[PDB]
Design a binder for these strands. Structure first.
Ligand SMILES: [Mn+2]
Ligand SMILES: [Mn+2]
Ligand SMILES: [Mn+2]
Lengths: 427, 419
DNA sequence: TTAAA
DNA sequence: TTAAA
RNA sequence: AAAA
């Protein structure tokens, strides 16, 4: 009977990692967790212990040991002696990575006196190594222990998750037999260092013409009044000062979905109805105003992830959505898992500081919610390099690592965004 | 000699609190910190230990002990054997609250060979010996708190140095009193709706419209209609709020919207409009809440500028500054308050992320963030659930208030903060 | 519970 | 480094 | 997983 003992704190991922690596060598498993006590402002980590038992397949070889007070040395010592298994064990391995400082201090010494092979362990979050106290070995688990998106979100209490594959992408369904032509044309301009010029034309005249009153592109009356009120106008900027590579992008859409009417801007007559207007520009405007960039970035990384033996739908995906039980859901543009570190990618074409700054707070908090406190967040913006370096420094929080856990890319990174994501995440 | 040993992690506040309370009873102090080794992704907590020595006035009775690897047991014990003071100490007290788990285990065991251990419970605000409540015993100011978290250039305003008191001098008290009456009479929801329509449809068209008369006159023409709703369907209490403003800073020409003639220059427009629009668009709500909180804390022991203030801004060295609407310190816990008048879920969610992260940066991982919005009760509850994060405690660290709380917001903040 | 403004 | 949109 |  070889027993492995884990300390269940509020970060379940370290215990899942050590469990996945050591279960093959032990016969019994003791999960020490906290009880809920409102009077001392103590919540319970029991939900994580069940998820640890579930996703490690411990079954009845798992012993749950609750602690009444995780900050009282006496109660911890007492609760251990009363509830710790008294069977004669040959080996006792305690990984003291989780829990409070009082938990690790007193559990360790209680099991250092009671015992018989003994070994203390700790998983390093910085360099991904399992350090043994007496064996003096530091084995890396970075490339060996794996985890998929379902397991990772589940042990963090997130259920009902869905996402899109490369083949089931939403705008492929909307632009059948055109999507590849539209996406190949955009990609070529972005790889031709036209990203900056695109986002300027997108701000003016594009967003001046095709944005404003809600349902502007679905009621011809609203769109009629808007173009009249645009009669210095963005229409001439579009008609007369639109560069050629955008004309190539605009003409990549099918004629029935082109924003242009030749080499000028399509304006509906009084014959064109509400549904006619919507069927022409709605999907094309929504794709050009931002959705295209989600697909572009995902397309520039899928090959590099498959080369590293990652599997789509388990280790990367697009348009992920998840939620806790009976709680609102959230959306994440792209997700990636390197070994067992979550990387969440949030995308925007905006170049405006305030908007991107708020995007940064968002992606930081979401990856902590679903991947634990060692996740990495990447924000990709249309800002210049000075603005992106400013944002990283603005939002950086110090956890004890030299490597950044919040990364901002900008408009100068778009043309080679594949390799830059690859270097940031895996190197 | 009686020596106190602290473990310097990346949260310096528990070490300040434990240090403030136990400095009196001890002679020497050992601060065990981490070296910087980029090759193992390990950064140094030396900057925090220096701040601990400075703001606790440890002077030369403080000994910095570095560790080359805070993740490796043997490398720790070695650096502990070769560096820890071998002088004869009659009493040794190790507080193992900070640092990594390896640090607290092997430093504890090292010192036990040569003894008392203590720990500061973040959940019940007590120091526990291997239990004294410090919640109302140890105090800190905004300057000390941000400084130990490495922030500098801290500035903020007082009730009497509020910026808009200098922009509407001889009229701010009437303006603020008018707005407060409307919110005290449960008209917050009505006010919010009128700001969304037609106020922000007229005065928030695009960029720098309130600065260029050409841009403003153009926007007026396209509207000609929210100008009609403004002139005709504006509630009486809102006309009273508008007419409380100085005449050269009024948005209304009599009982109708003012329209600049070609004569009005860019300086004449902005001086008449820009300050008034920005205050009504939402800055008023910052002042309203602050005035209510300063009222409720009139009996408590907090001093303005040490434990609460408005419009806090600070920065790290060579780093961008942030802005925080209101700050409060209860004992040694930072309470950050972000205010918005918006009723929109998307906008209020993004403000929630912001205030959760900011208070964590400047006040440590045990800070409390409060977001005050103009949403209804169902949306505020949904937002609290959406953004909640498990900390180990049963009391919430992210709190959202909505439009129904505006009238009694002073009592609401007092009850949430002081428990 | 679009994306950007 | 507006607060809203 | 460096006041769970
Ligand atoms: Mn699976
Ligand atoms: Mn996005
Ligand atoms: Mn605010």
């Amino acid at each position: 009977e070889k027993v492995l003992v884990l300390i269940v704190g509020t970060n379940p991922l370290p215990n899942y990692v050590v469990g996945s690596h050591l279960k093959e060598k032990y016969d019994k498993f003791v999960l020490i967790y906290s009880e809920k006590n409102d009077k001392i402002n103590q919540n319970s980590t029991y939900d994580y212990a069940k998820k640890l038992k579930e996703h490690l397949n411990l079954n009845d070889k798992c012993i749950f040991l609750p602690l009444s007070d995780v900050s009282n040395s006496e109660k911890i010592i007492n609760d251990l002696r009363e509830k710790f298994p008294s069977e004669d064990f040959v080996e006792v391995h305690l990984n003291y990575t989780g829990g409070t400082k009082t938990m690790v201090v007193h559990i360790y010494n209680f099991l250092k006196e009671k015992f018989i092979k003994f070994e203390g362990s700790y998983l390093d979050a910085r360099d991904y190594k399992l350090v043994y106290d007496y064996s003096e070995e530091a084995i890396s688990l970075k490339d060996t222990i794996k985890i998929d998106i379902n397991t990772l979100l589940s042990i963090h209490l997130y259920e009902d998750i869905h996402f899109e594959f490369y083949d089931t992408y939403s705008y492929k369904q909307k632009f059948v037999d055109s999507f590849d032509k539209i996406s190949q044309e955009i990609e070529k301009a972005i790889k031709d260092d036209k990203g900056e010029d695109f986002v300027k034309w997108l701000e003016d005249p594009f967003r001046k013409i095709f944005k404003g009153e809600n349902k502007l592109l679905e009621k011809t009356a609203k769109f009629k009044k808007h173009i009249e009120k645009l009669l210095s106008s963005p229409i001439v900027k579009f008609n007369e000062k639109t560069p050629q590579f955008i004309w190539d992008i605009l003409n990549a859409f099918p004629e029935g979905k082109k924003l242009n009417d030749g080499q000028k801007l399509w304006i509906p007559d009084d014959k064109i109805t509400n549904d006619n207007l919507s069927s022409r520009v709605k999907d094309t405007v929504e794709f050009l105003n931002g959705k295209w960039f989600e697909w572009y970035v995902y397309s520039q990384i899928k090959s590099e992830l498959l080369d590293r033996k990652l599997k789509e739908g388990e280790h990367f995906g697009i348009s992920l959505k998840a939620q806790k039980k009976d709680s609102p859901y959230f959306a994440l543009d792209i997700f990636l898992i390197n070994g067992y570190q979550l990387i969440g990618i949030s995308l925007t074409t905006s170049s405006t500081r305030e908007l991107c700054k708020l995007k940064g707070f968002e992606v930081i908090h979401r990856v902590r919610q679903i991947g634990g406190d060692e996740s990495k967040a990447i924000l990709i913006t249309g800002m210049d390099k000075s603005k992106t370096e400013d944002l990283q420094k603005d939002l950086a929080y110090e956890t004890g690592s030299t490597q950044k856990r919040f990364v901002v890319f900008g408009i100068d990174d778009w043309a080679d965004i594949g390799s830059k994501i690859c270097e940031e995440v895996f190197k």
